[PDB]
Every structure is written in structure tokens, then in C-alpha cells.
Design a protein around this ligand. Structure first.
Ligand SMILES: Nc1ncnc2c1ncn2[C@@H]1O[C@H](COP(=O)(O)OC(=O)[C@@H](N)Cc2c[nH]c3ccccc23)[C@@H](O)[C@H]1O
Ligand SMILES: N[C@@H](Cc1c[nH]c2ccccc12)C(=O)O
Lengths: 324, 333
């Protein structure tokens, strides 16, 4: 199988956009690819934050990914800091990365971790002979750097690394912000009323969906039109993504119906989806023995592959081999 | 337990009399008085592009040179940097508590960038943070280095204090141990420039593994000054070459500059250079004699690296565990 690598931020608070788009897509392709999920706690500390919240957030992220359907028997899921090889290769690749490349990444008070993390990201990918990396637009420059580092290192020492590719085909589900249906729903939003988080209760979902922007059409008509009726179209897309019903099916279902009925059905459908997900989440999250065993097994698998690459990197560079 | 000494040297170029006087001399003398840990910093060496065969050979050369200088593996921990993963691990973590402006202002980064304009890499920029990690891993009290590493060590102190201020008594704040004489041995044909272990002009340098006969000839050709009459006197501004020769003689013999100045009253630069040549040539002959016994004994060099890496890993893992707990990582099972 081709190897897929994804880096999951611990501090992230996932939305229905994250789940119904990319994550649900990838949960169903775990037998097609050798999928690797790395909870990137070493990347997280580039932003200063409360230590106890970071530890909590790492375990929250682990349980949530497991709740979404990531299978630790099929996929490799692990914590970044538990595999030393990431930091080790990170340093090695610094010496084959131009300062210029990092300065040009899209002043004196910035920490060196924030300046240097694209090299650690390159190490995260290249450690596991990664074939494919599913990235968003804002991470595309970083993937290109990892491809450039890999080719540069390979040209000097032979084919040590696989040159990774972006995972091109996009999810399918379109989830836009509730008060700004032109902008995509993103976990990074400051206006929380634009998003619906995966751990939101049914009362919170009703509140946010009720407030969601629609249009001033008279009569109100539930029809799909991203240009003229962005808000109503987003509500249809969300409902479609949840239930699997096509857009023209929903358009027929809501014939002669106001936006109040649509919003009611959207809220009900999303919370129906989020309840089964939350059940799994809280069950996994409160079982510390389960989470510890997943992290141990995951790190053991990751380390097996990671150490083989780093050995070849170290041999190529010419370091004296460690005496075990 | 004794206070801890930590220091390192790169397996790149060929270590000089400068590297000896500024660092290695002090390393040997500190072994009983303090708990000493010495490192061959191969991860730092690759910030300048190395040939793979040259790096491997130079790592083992440097190890053998420590042993030849008198670094006893029964007294001190001797290890290769890349053999202990914790250096790279704490190296990354400390990037997040190091400012960009601190690294860009570094003299060594600027000097090396001008020299290797075709390879101004991120490793060369990030050099001080990994160096800080090297020191802070072992609860280090003293760091014996030459004058040129003063700025790097000052940042290690700032990082340690900055980290401790947030999280508690995780690191010891290290102190420099820079010698009185021989802290910055200067180049023989350019006494205003520091002696480099990778100088393009070999006549500037006294290599520790260089033929003594070649070294004596280099001392004879070292530039002095136009003073009439010639006078053996210490004056860095006006008599840089003579002052550098006196500094080298002082560091090798243990005699003070005023003691040597009095000794060379009524003498000129022939006497000075004769004494410097005799003292240095005698030192290098003995050193090189021990070196080949160590360097050609691969089984012994392998055992030193194994034992040393094991001892270092025990200290390093303890510190990294505490660092990781403090910043809020989930602890490894
Ligand atoms: N002309 C000279 N005169 C007197 N002393 C000199 C001269 N040139 C060099 N030195 C000193 O030799 C030591 C090794 O230098 P390196 O370039 O190998 O290597 C260096 O410059 C360090 N960054 C290696 C290192 C890495 N991590 C560490 C942690 C603690 C101490 C040292 C290190 C140094 O002490 C240096 O000050
Ligand atoms: N930089 C990514 C996280 C990440 C770290 N390493 C990666 C490797 C591949 C993909 C993603 C990652 C983010 O901020 O979202």
C-alpha cells in the first residue's frame, strides 16, 4: 500500500467541516493505504501555552480521532514526542535546508521553533517513506519544501527518501461558516458562532443553526444556489453531507417550506450525527488504560519504521554508528 | 555528587594548538576535581558541509585525540553527540524558548555565513540552541571553552534562566571556564585573526596531528613587527605577533607573561621563537606518540563510545523527562 502521513494538532478543536470532509473520507480508506496519524505536540509548543492544557489536548485529540473511526489496528496513530527520530531527523535536515527558504516561508521577537518548524514537518513526512500527504492550501508551501529537501538529499547520497506527493482529490462535503457562508468553516475561526464543534450538545447546535445567515427571498424558497443563496445552500450541503440525501431530493422534500423547517432538520440531523460520535469519544477518552496502550503500540510501530530511515540518513551523512 | 563539567569539539577540520589551549588543556586538568563529560559534536560539525568518509574518520580522530591529550575514560564520560537522541530532542524543545533575534545577532553565524555563502543553512543558524541543549541536558555547572564561544554560552544561560522562570528548577545555569592564557590563540601569518581549525592557508595553523618539523618551520615564519630594537613585550595592538607567541609559550609552560618578559630581556625574536618551537614541538611529539596507540585500536575506541553513550544517556534521559513533564507532553510509556 502507499504510505499516507497526516499531522494532527493537539490544540485543535475539530468542527463538522473537519469531520464530514477530510476525516470521514480518510476513515473509509484505512485498508486502501498504510495511514499514519501523528499528534504533533512538538509543533504545538511553537506557540506558548499552558502545560496541563497541552497534555489534556493531546489526549482529547487522540480519543476524538479514535471516535471518528481511526482504527489503531489498521492505521498507525501516535504522539510525535514519543518517537525521538522526528527531532533527530529534524536537526539533520536543518543542515540541508537554506536559511533563505525558511525566511521566505509565507520579527526578532519570533521564537526559533516558529521559524524552524517547516524542517521538523519535512522530517515528520520523510521519516516514514511517505508517498502521499493530504494538505490544506496553507500547508502547501511546507510540503513543497519537504519535496525539495528530499530531492536535494537524494541527489547527494542516493535514494534515501521517497519524494512525497500531495493527496489531490478533495473530500466532497462542503461546509461553510454559518454567519459568513462565503468563507469555509474552519476550526481556527475566532467567531465560534461560525462553527459547530464535534463535542457541542443539541441545545448549542440549535442555537447556532437558528442564527445562521440565509436570504431575503419572498417567498422563502429552499433551493441550491451558491451565488445568490449562499446561506441556504450551505444548510442544504450540511444536511446532504449528514444524511446522504442528494440536493434535488432535499429541494423536493422542502418544497413549499420556509427556512425555519430547514434549520430545524439541519440541527436535528447534525446532533443525531454528533451524539453517536460523542458516545464513542467520552467512552474512549475516560479509559486511560486504552489510550495508553494505543499510544504505546502506535509509538512502537512508528519507531520501527522511523529508525530504519534515520539509520540510512545517518549512514549517508557519515556519522559513526551507535554502539548498541 | 561533584559539580558537572560539560564541553565538546567538532569532528571537522583538524584540531589545532588553539583548540588545545582554549579547551582541551582545561578538560584534562578538571577530571578529578569535577564530574567531567566530553563530547564529539558530530551533529554540529555537519552545519558546514562534510564529506561522509571525512566525517567518520574525523569523529574517530577526535575521539583518539581526547584520549591522547589525557582524557581518561575511567574518570570522564566520552561520547559521540549523535549516539544520544536527547540532544536533538531538547534541541527542538529549546527552539521554542529561543528568540530569532538572539540567533541572527550571533558573531559565529555571521562569520560562517560570509565564508560559506553557498551553504547558509538552518543548522548553522540554529547552532546555538543545540549547543544549549548539549550543556543543559547534564545539569552542567562549568563549561570549559575558548573565548570565541563566550557569546554562545551566554545564550545557554539566558535560555536556562528563561525556561526555569516558567517551569521551576529544571536546568542548572552554567558558567564559562575560559583560561587566563591561550583562550584565543591567533593565526601565525595574521595575528589579528583567530587561529582556525579549517584555515585555507595551512601556514597560519599549528595542527595537533601535524609533523613537528613542519610546526617548527611555521613558528620561525610567524610574523612579528618592525620594532627597532626588537623587544619581546606584550602589546596586542602594536605587537600582535610577538604577543601571540608569548601567549602560546605561557599556556604551554605555565609561566606568566611578566615572567617570560623578564626572561627575554636583552633577547630578540630568535630567542622567543626558539623557545616557542621547542615547547610546542616537544608537546606535539608526546601527544602524537600516545595518539597512534589509541587511534589504531578500534576495539578500544568502540568500547569508549559504547560505555560513554550509556553513561550520557542516563543523565540526558532524566533531564529530558523533567523538561517534557514541565512543558506538558504526555509521557512516553
Ligand atoms: N584559536 C583558538 N584559540 C583558543 N581556543 C579555540 C580557538 N579556536 C577554537 N577554540 C576553542 O576550541 C573548542 C572547540 O571548538 P570547535 O570549533 O571544535 O567547537 C565549538 O566551537 C563549540 N561550539 C563546540 C560545542 C558544541 N556544543 C558544545 C557544548 C559545550 C561546549 C562546546 C560545545 C571551543 O571551546 C573553542 O572555543
Ligand atoms: N503543520 C501542520 C501539522 C503537521 C505537522 N507535521 C505534518 C506533516 C504532514 C501534515 C501535517 C503536519 C499544521 O499546522 O496543521
Amino acid at each position: 500500500k502507499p504510505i499516507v502521513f497526516s499531522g494532527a494538532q493537539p490544540s485543535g478543536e475539530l468542527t463538522i467541516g473537519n469531520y464530514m470532509g477530510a476525516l470521514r473520507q480518510w476513515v473509509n480508506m484505512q485498508d486502501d493505504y498504510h495511514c499514519i496519524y501523528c499528534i504533533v505536540d512538538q509543533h504545538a509548543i511553537t506557540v506558548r501555552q499552558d502545560a496541563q492544557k497541552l497534555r489534556k489536548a493531546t489526549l482529547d485529540t487522540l480519543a476524538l480521532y479514535l471516535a471518528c473511526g481511526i482504527d489503531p489496528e489498521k492505521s498507525t496513530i501516535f504522539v510525535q514526542s514519543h518517537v525521538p527520530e522526528h527531532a533527530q531527523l529534524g536537526w539533520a535536515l536543518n543542515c540541508y535546508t537554506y536559511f533563505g527558504e525558511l525566511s521566505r516561508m509565507t520579527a526578532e521577537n519570533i521564537n526559533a521553533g516558529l521559524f524552524d518548524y517547516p524542517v521538523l514537518m519535512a522530517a515528520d513526512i520523510l521519516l516514514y517513506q511517505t508517498n502521499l500527504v493530504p494538505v490544506g492550501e496553507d500547508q502547501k508551501q511546507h510540503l513543497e519544501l519537504s519535496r525539495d529537501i528530499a530531492q536535494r538529499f537524494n541527489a547527494l547520497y542516493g535514494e534515501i527518501f521517497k519524494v512525497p506527493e500531495p493527496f489531490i482529490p478533495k473530500s466532497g462535503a462542503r461546509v461553510m461558516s454559518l454567519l459568513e457562508p462565503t468563507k469555509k468553516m474552519s476550526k481556527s475561526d475566532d467567531n465560534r458562532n461560525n462553527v459547530i464543534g464535534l463535542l457541542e450538545d443539541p441545545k448549542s447546535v440549535v442555537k447556532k443553526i437558528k442564527r445562521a445567515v440565509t436570504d431575503s427571498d419572498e417567498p422563502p424558497v429552499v433551493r441550491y444556489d451558491v451565488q445568490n443563496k449562499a446561506g441556504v445552500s450551505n444548510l442544504l450541503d450540511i444536511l446532504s453531507a449528514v444524511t446522504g440525501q442528494s440536493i434535488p431530493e432535499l429541494e423536493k422534500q422542502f418544497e413549499g417550506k420556509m427556512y425555519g423547517h430547514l434549520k430545524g432538520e439541519v440541527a436535528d440531523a447534525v446532533s443525531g450525527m454528533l451524539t453517536e460520535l460523542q458516545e464513542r469519544y467520552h467512552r474512549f477518552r475516560n479509559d486511560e488504560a486504552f489510550l495508553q496502550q494505543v499510544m504505546k503500540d502506535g509509538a512502537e510501530k512508528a519507531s520501527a519504521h522511523a529508525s530504519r530511515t534515520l539509520k540510512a540518513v545517518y549512514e549517508a551523512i557519515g556519522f559513526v554508528a551507535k554502539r548498541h
